[PDB]
Amino acid sequence: RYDEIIFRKLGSMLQTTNILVTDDQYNIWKKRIEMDLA
Amino acid sequence: TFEGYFDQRHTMSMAPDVTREEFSLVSNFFNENFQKRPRQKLFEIQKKMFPQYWFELTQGFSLLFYGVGSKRNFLEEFAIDYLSPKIAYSQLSIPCLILNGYNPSCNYRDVFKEITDLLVPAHVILQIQKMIDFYKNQPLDIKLILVVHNLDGPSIRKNTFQTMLSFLSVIRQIAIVASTDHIYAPLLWDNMKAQNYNFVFHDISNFEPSTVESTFQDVMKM
Amino acid sequence: IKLFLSTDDNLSQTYDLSIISKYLLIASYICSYLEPRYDASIFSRKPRYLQPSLFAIERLLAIFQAIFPSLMKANIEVFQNLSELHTLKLIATTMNKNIDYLSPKVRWKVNVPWEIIKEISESVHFNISDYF
Amino acid sequence: RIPTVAPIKLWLKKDVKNVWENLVQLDFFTEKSAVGLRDNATAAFYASNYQFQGTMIPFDLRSYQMQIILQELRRIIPKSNMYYSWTQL
Amino acid sequence: ADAQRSHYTVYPDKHIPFVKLLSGKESEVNVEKRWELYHQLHSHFHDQVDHIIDNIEADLKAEISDLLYSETTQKRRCFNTIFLLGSDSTTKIELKDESSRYNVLIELTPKESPNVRMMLRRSMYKLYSAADAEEYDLSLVENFKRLFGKDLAMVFNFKDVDSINFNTLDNFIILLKSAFKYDHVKISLIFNINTNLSNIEKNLRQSTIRLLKRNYHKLDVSSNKGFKYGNQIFQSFLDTVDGKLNLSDRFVEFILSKMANNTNHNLQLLTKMLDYSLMSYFFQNAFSVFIDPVNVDFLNDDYLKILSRCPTFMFFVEGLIKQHAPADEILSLLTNKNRGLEEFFVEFLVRENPINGHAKFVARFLEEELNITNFNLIELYHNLLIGKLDSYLDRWSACKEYKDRLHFEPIDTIFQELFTLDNRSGLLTQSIFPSYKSNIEDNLLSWEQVLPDLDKIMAPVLGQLFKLYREANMTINIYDFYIAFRETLPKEEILNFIRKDPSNTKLLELAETPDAFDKVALILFMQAIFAFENMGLIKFQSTKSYDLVEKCVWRGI
């Protein structure tokens, strides 16, 4: 990844802040349980 | 590391001499041909910070541009093409003052004449004190945009010049944009100046060649 | 009795300084009184009555990094505190007219006596006395 | 060199400063390179403008020199003085 | 050209600085509501701050005026002295416009005092100019009452005592002492002292100091004074919040770190972080719209994704699974039907946190009933957030009588994360306390973190040359450095890159020269060294030889 790196280096507020779980990680967590849910 | 500091008959005539005109040849061609697109790509991406820069300027935070490479062109695009037109077409043509620090012939008294004419309705510090008392009652509206290229310039490094610029940022109706190149630039400012400047720092290193600043110092002396 | 036991000609925690500020001054006195010969011998892992000598800015930062409690690095605050000491006149420069810090020919020296720095190290728990 | 106690003040470094100032006024001491009085007003004009090293270095590190040699001290100081025994080395 | 001039002036929908969130899905109305909500709190914050700042200055001028006119009936004509400890050149003093006595303020900068001759002339020049507006030596002082028919009271403002040549100042003070022969003249002296009285007591002659000590007043004007104003501003920050936002332990931790790095100007640095954090929340977080629970009806499925990823909700879902809650309830909330949890979220918005009320209670209780003032509210609030307030209260021995009252129970309310301030990605450090020296070195070394057919191979010379600078010794034989730099260059690829231009004759003209590679390397080398000269990287030995250079910085320090 490059855009996140340059945003972090530039100190821009466009880059997201990692206080919440990432969208990809939470999506994987939801899907791995939904596939075994029904 | 610091340990790398404690752990530390040829002449230049042995190198082939290059004339002044020959020097400008190779530099100009490679400054355009070499690393053309990636630097332009980085520049275009960096334009996305204009709303954040514009937001920060309105709140009263000076913007300091630092990093490797020339920063004259970046400041020109921001203030002229984005900053000045947007303020006028949103507050309802804002004058922009450009100061060159790379020129060693710059004089602070000549600069202050423009400030008095453009802001003061008709011993420099005493006049600045009058302005602060005037703009207290004035509405918090941006009136003049100030850009100071090379705040580490040879005629600008001096303490008297630094004090003059630092007092200007106290008045909220003036927008200040500055750029520096020296590594020890923060040493030039103590608490009394850093508080007045009210900087917000941005690393804007672009590796842009400094053709303009290279004109005021001869390479033949090397 | 207590009136005569002191002259009281004196005009009257003597210097409120930050943690970064305290180590900055401690490192400088080493530069102003220790020979450059001994910089590598003491600090690398490989005169009280004389007037202080000059030193370069690179010598100060290296020693400051060397004794600061992994590296400390030199952010804006470190230089911000360093310039204030010059403004506070605890460190002197080699000029009197048109002060320009970034001019390479200017050197630095310590304007603080031994007795003041003695008490500074006590609040820091840095044992300067063993370096001489 | 005094018998002790069976169950002379050292003046503080601050109070000596006035004592130190008196000796420079009375010309017992003199600065390391004290040129002194100039001969002409134009020459003195440069002196009144130039700032020497001694005007900037701390009060406790200004180098001085002496007008009276210890031998002359021992020739003049009364033998009743307690520090007479310290006139020599 | 215009760039050759020292300075020159250039003349050139309705924009709102905020930008769309949710990849442009954010509505126009919400941004304006976001724009308006930010202004509401931001203006509310500054109204208390500006009142406090103006109150502080009013107190200072009141005290300064009191000292200047605390008329002491000394039998001897002597100076009136005020020592402004920790002051700056920015402060100002205004005098009474009395009838019988003409009051004039005299400023004395170190630039105006190179010698005693200059001091006397300039002081009289300013005195005459002020006297000229009534309707250059001491004879003007003697002639003043006959010239203008009024008594003269002079106040000398030593705007910066430290930089003043004490030898000149010591002589000038004695010069002013001759004014006591006149009966119509009175003099006052104001000293701007930065560090302490100790600097004065060293450089001034001890005979001079006995003049000042006869009539003097000692005053402190530093902004930092027993957390008296820092607590008030920090509490006012909580007050203007009105419980609509919260603080994390990490954020207060960062504030406590930077507060100790400045001694006399914390308030302006404190204001930077609080406002910048307030700015950050509105620009980044979309849930700032729901500060007012009226705006709840604006929810979309995208907002539920943010709600789904709240730490207090991530484990709450697994609590239902592990406590055998019905799977239909879990299925209903995850597949976003009937969205009943939003009412619980509505409650959290309404729920006032007792943290602010208890802390304000404790602060008032400490100030008024325990009479404790030597304390920091930022530390007090941080211990509350960590839940370690009991240890913090143990600092003071008088808390024993009321530890049960002052004890508080922090609770991690659900969805509080969306309304807390924290330092998590360094966005509050990369732009406010940057590693200015470190960033340049990293950019010089790691160029790939900045930049995204010779361009694909060779990095910029400025960064590449820095590698040799780190490897170089303290002093450099530039000819050897030039050769060393030349050996690293891709000669054949560069020469083939030079030849690519078909019509640039001046480039091809040099390409015929076998020494062009040496010339091209030197042109790149000399230009780079000049850039190194500007950046403070290299310093020449031109007094001995231009062919040797010395390093001026090292990596990682």
From Swiss-Prot, chain A:
The gene is ORC6. It is found in: Nucleus. It comes from Saccharomyces cerevisiae (strain ATCC 204508 / S288c) (Baker's yeast). Component of the origin recognition complex (ORC) that binds origins of replication. It has a role in both chromosomal replication and mating type transcriptional silencing. Binds to the ARS consensus sequence (ACS) of origins of replication. This is Origin recognition complex subunit 6. Present with 2970 molecules/cell in log phase SD medium. Belongs to the ORC6 family. Component of the origin recognition complex (ORC) composed of at least ORC1, ORC2, ORC3, ORC4, ORC5 and ORC6. Interacts with ORC3, ORC5 and TAH11.
From Swiss-Prot, chain B:
GO terms for cellular component: chromosome, telomeric region; DNA replication preinitiation complex; nuclear origin of replication recognition complex; nuclear pre-replicative complex; nucleoplasm; nucleus. It is found in: Nucleus. GO terms for biological process: DNA replication initiation; pre-replicative complex assembly involved in nuclear cell cycle DNA replication; silent mating-type cassette heterochromatin formation; subtelomeric heterochromatin formation. Its main location: nucleus. One of its GO terms (molecular function) is chromatin binding. The keyword Nucleus applies. Keywords: DNA replication, Nucleus, Phosphoprotein. Belongs to the ORC2 family. Component of the origin recognition complex (ORC) that binds origins of replication. It has a role in both chromosomal replication and mating type transcriptional silencing. Binds to the ARS consensus sequence (ACS) of origins of replication. Component of the origin recognition complex (ORC) composed of at least ORC1, ORC2, ORC3, ORC4, ORC5 and ORC6. Interacts with MCM10 and TAH11. Present with 1700 molecules/cell in log phase SD medium. This is Origin recognition complex subunit 2. It comes from Saccharomyces cerevisiae (strain ATCC 204508 / S288c) (Baker's yeast). The lineage of its organism: Eukaryota, Fungi, Dikarya, Ascomycota, Saccharomycotina. The chain holds residues 242 to 498 of 620 of the full protein.
UniProtKB/Swiss-Prot annotation, chain C:
It comes from Saccharomyces cerevisiae (strain ATCC 204508 / S288c). GO terms for cellular component: Cul8-RING ubiquitin ligase complex; DNA replication preinitiation complex; nuclear origin of replication recognition complex; nuclear pre-replicative complex; nucleoplasm; nucleus. Belongs to the ORC5 family. Keywords: ATP-binding, DNA replication, Nucleotide-binding, Nucleus. It is found in: Nucleus. Transmembrane segments: none annotated. Present with 768 molecules/cell in log phase SD medium. GO terms for biological process: DNA replication initiation; pre-replicative complex assembly involved in nuclear cell cycle DNA replication; regulation of DNA replication; silent mating-type cassette heterochromatin formation. Component of the origin recognition complex (ORC) composed of at least ORC1, ORC2, ORC3, ORC4, ORC5 and ORC6. Interacts with ORC6. Component of a cullin-RING ligase (CRL)-like complex composed of at least the cullin RTT101, a linker protein MMS1, and the potential substrate receptor ORC5. Interacts with RTT101 and MMS1. One of its GO terms (molecular function) is DNA replication origin binding. This is Origin recognition complex subunit 5.
From Swiss-Prot, chain D:
Present with 2170 molecules/cell in log phase SD medium. It comes from the Eukaryota. Belongs to the ORC4 family. Component of the origin recognition complex (ORC) composed of at least ORC1, ORC2, ORC3, ORC4, ORC5 and ORC6. The chain holds residues 425 to 529 of 529 of the full protein. It is found in: Nucleus. Component of the origin recognition complex (ORC) that binds origins of replication. It has a role in both chromosomal replication and mating type transcriptional silencing. Binds to the ARS consensus sequence (ACS) of origins of replication. This is Origin recognition complex subunit 4.
